[PDB]
Subunit: 295 residues, 4 copies
Amino acid sequence: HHHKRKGIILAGGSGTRLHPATLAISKQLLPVYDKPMIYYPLSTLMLAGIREILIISTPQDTPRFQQLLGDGSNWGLDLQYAVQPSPDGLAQAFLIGESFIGNDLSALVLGDNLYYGHDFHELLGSASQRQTGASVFAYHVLDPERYGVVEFDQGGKAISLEEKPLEPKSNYAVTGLYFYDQQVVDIARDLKPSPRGELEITDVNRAYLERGQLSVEIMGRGYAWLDTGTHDSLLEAGQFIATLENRQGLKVACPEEIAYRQKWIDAAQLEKLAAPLAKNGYGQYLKRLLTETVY
Amino acid sequence: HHHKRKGIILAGGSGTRLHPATLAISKQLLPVYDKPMIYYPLSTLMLAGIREILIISTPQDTPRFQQLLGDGSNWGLDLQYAVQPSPDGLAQAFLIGESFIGNDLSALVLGDNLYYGHDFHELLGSASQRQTGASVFAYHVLDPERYGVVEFDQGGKAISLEEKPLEPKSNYAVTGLYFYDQQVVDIARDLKPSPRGELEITDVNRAYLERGQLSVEIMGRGYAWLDTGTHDSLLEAGQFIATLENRQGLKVACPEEIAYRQKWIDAAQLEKLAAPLAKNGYGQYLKRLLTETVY
Amino acid sequence: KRKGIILAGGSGTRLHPATLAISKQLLPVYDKPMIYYPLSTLMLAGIREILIISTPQDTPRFQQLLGDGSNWGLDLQYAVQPSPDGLAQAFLIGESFIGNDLSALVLGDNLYYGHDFHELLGSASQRQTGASVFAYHVLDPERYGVVEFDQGGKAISLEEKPLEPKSNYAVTGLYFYDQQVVDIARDLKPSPRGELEITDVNRAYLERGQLSVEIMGRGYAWLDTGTHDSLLEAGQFIATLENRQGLKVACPEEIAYRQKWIDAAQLEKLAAPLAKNGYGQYLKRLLTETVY
Amino acid sequence: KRKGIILAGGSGTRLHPATLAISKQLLPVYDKPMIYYPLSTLMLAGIREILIISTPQDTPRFQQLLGDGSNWGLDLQYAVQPSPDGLAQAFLIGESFIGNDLSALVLGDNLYYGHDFHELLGSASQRQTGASVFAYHVLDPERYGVVEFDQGGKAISLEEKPLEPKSNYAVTGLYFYDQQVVDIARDLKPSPRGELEITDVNRAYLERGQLSVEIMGRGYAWLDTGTHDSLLEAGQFIATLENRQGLKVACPEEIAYRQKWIDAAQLEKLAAPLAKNGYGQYLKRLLTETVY
Ligand SMILES: Cc1cc(Cn2c(N)c(N(C)S(=O)(=O)c3ccccc3)c(=O)[nH]c2=O)ccc1Br
Ligand SMILES: Cc1cc(Cn2c(N)c(N(C)S(=O)(=O)c3ccccc3)c(=O)[nH]c2=O)ccc1Br
Ligand SMILES: Cc1cc(Cn2c(N)c(N(C)S(=O)(=O)c3ccccc3)c(=O)[nH]c2=O)ccc1Br
Ligand SMILES: Cc1cc(Cn2c(N)c(N(C)S(=O)(=O)c3ccccc3)c(=O)[nH]c2=O)ccc1Br
Ligand SMILES: [Cl-]
Ligand SMILES: [Cl-]
Ligand SMILES: [Cl-]
Ligand SMILES: [Cl-]
């Protein structure tokens, strides 16, 4: 009898690549300017209207995310948690997240991706509304070799996907934000590991492409999709957010704000979250959101 | 007998505020990352479909802008030039630009304002399409005291404008990009100087407001409106553009690109502009635009 | 001999939510945890025996990061400061650690850089009586302990965060002390603000005419990591220097190796688990390259 | 006595369109034109008599900025380099300016910062025979003149932009010369690349055993302003230092005042037209404040 879309954030082991900074704490707990990196994809899923979210991290890191975020109920969310013992590729998320997904639609977001721009809400909404097939976003980059790359024909139809090609067919990278129908778990179960031993998200997306069920929306150049892959790019992302926030006196990817604007929490709930933070600019910001109209 | 909108860039004296950097060359000739500051508002007017543009600068600086930009015909534009002897306020632009405006619609842009974001073309187009009255944009800022400030009532109607108020009524600044009908010159002619001796753009905009002819569109938080008022903010703006451009391998506010995408110049014309620039990344970029599809 | 204290104290809620569930002095400045910077500073002054004082929450996190220090030729101990009751409390908490030895205190969020910094530390630590501090010209002296000089350059007053500062010389977060400091700290009354003040310890030395105040020149960088904006500035400053030089600032393994506290075999062992990133590659490179 | 040359040469089209109709070495690094930095460097080495060599297009722009230098206690002259035919051409163009005196050359886009920089310049300029250069450890030595040292630290080879560099020590864009340099430059054949190379002048001194190569230590900042990305890094580096200290790096008026080339009356006159911004306020402040 009938009378919905779940989220997954993959916040896994960045191995030893960013050591020694990441000896102290996992990558997606490092801040970008003023807030932990995971706040950014979490906020992204929230902006897409997703409230029920599974956070996949290492056994070691699970407790630390849990300590930061809890069960989400203060922000009107239902956050759950699962361990990824080993870094065996991004598609593993769907096998780990299998019982969490159930028979629902899903969205996957990488824990180290930051997005910003105008009408991002509307760009997400058109992905999450398409209730069959899958939807991904293509973004023009300088270094497409580092990503899944999309080739378009002359009428703008997607015709191939390639994982980290040495000779990319275009400058269009697939961003680390994906929307899936109920077929994803069964596609993911049939994947054989790749040459380097990972369950690849590109192979999942190619299965949808081969069935004619993949929507590739362009994420325009007027959106910022930022890179937290290196210490240098983590620093750029910090500068970028700081510049915007200090210009505007508005925050990017403040989860409490997003829950309040989605009406998942009300003004009294937002005031209670502001109380313990009253003595810093972040809690003062939440307080200011109770009385200021922001368009 | 019948069978159009002109642009003005006010690139005037920043006095001695940014000295000694500006002893060598005027403010709007200083670069923001890789291109002279004036490229940014020029590109903004171009994106609005404006081809016929008057550049107002000091007698000293006029020749230097002229040397940089010429008459615009290489980029499919008709740039003209006029001197502002003295820094007597922004509204003077309409008296200086009087014969240039003629009986047409106009757009005014400050030579030190940078804008960026998604569907900026569409945001401009809806201003320039409204062929009577005036249109301005409101942008949430931290420091509204430095700008013209807009007060909205509870239904979102603009009800007051104030120039640099010590006690701002909102955090909404009027950005330095304005669209005017044929009434602007006559409003500007009736302005008495303000307490500090300037012909104020806020007084022009209030005249439209009092006639019920001012449209105030919100420029959303997903747009970046950057500040080149200080050495620090000029540096932020540099970092901001560099981060975006190096992420994307695409340029922000490249005039040649904008003229090519407006179809004001064709592929052969763009190739000829790329030739003298062939030995640097900027000319290599223009060359790459001849063969790459960018969405 | 001289023992060191790093005060990696509580920043309260000021850097929340970055610091929710994540210790301030474990936040990275560019590529390495904040605490590497004061640690390296102490190590550069020749100090191997170091006490890390932090919150009840954060102390075990530093322990789990750094252990007893033996891998870098150090002797690290740990103590907790229950409550942010003033910087001078370090000497009470740290009484039995200091014992009857000379000491140096460094603040956990203070970053230093410059030419002959080794020698500037050397000259302070060699002075075996009195106390030694550094005065650095700053834009906002009101945020710090301020030093007033007379026309002949003698220090004549110290004030903690004065509303009307007598100079632009701030006392940096690096202090050297003789065997008197514990008893000076023990006889302190808390200030109006409710803190055992480090400036109050330093004035006590000044009143005895036993405070050396040396100028840390304008060619040195003393950076603060109090706020999100300063932490960011500091990252960009270090990254700019490191990417230019292909050398690191405040890499403890390098400093221990250069002090001869660890040898080439042990440096090589430290490089192995970091081999697949640039930090281990740098440690490996330091075995074969002559760096003047 | 020692005369100076600033080579503010042609960067071609590489920084276009920023440099279209606007001279490279007049682009600002943070708050001041690029050329203030090498000028100040020369001024810090005690050199008052300075030749600015630039393009036919840019030379009069520097002239119109700086004039004869008399307002800062300097003696500035100007010469043109018709074509970017190598850095060593400075000595041919500058032959009659150098006369029979000692010289120093500095590259117009080179920025230096650090403790006791004054003394490092002092020691090079005091050496009245041979030539003196500085070797600075860098990440990308292939972009520079590279110095090879033997196991005892003696310089044994110099190579201009080697595809396989023998070390990570780059020769900085600051060179001190005796009365031989003009005749060495005059006897140079152009390289395969079509340039009169400064490394070729320096090897000629090395071959005579008259090249001093001193290490510019890792505590000094030597920044390059070749590209848009480096020019930006340099701005952020200087701004971070200046906003922290409330002191300026490479403010020529301050350096002339501190060298006693201009007095307090003249510094005050220079402050007046800049009074309404921070730069003049700083100059005014330097009349009453003691800065160590
Ligand atoms: C429509 C709508 C607007 C907003 C306003 N908003 C926006 N636009 C943003 N952005 C600037 S965003 O859409 O680009 C964005 C949202 C979440 C995470 C990253 C970026 C934000 O960070 N926070 C925020 O409250 C929030 C919720 C909803 Br529903
Ligand atoms: C529709 C359209 C898109 C573009 C693409 N484009 C965009 N979007 C941008 N932007 C990132 S922008 O719309 O925010 C912008 C344009 C001009 C000046 C500043 C920002 C740009 O700088 N250059 C550019 O070619 C150009 C012309 C036209 Br008409
Ligand atoms: C003399 C000496 C030099 C060095 C080299 N060195 C230097 N100079 C530095 N500096 C750039 S520093 O002296 O300004 C510095 C040292 C420790 C912590 C911060 C800065 C460094 O960070 N690491 C380093 O190995 C190490 C130990 C000793 Br003893
Ligand atoms: C000893 C001395 C110190 C000073 C102080 N000083 C210093 N140290 C600096 N430096 C920070 S510097 O020596 O590293 C430097 C000098 C000139 C150009 C670049 C950096 C400066 O920029 N300006 C300045 O007035 C001036 C003249 C003389 Br002689
Ligand atoms: Cl876009
Ligand atoms: Cl928006
Ligand atoms: Cl110094
Ligand atoms: Cl050094």
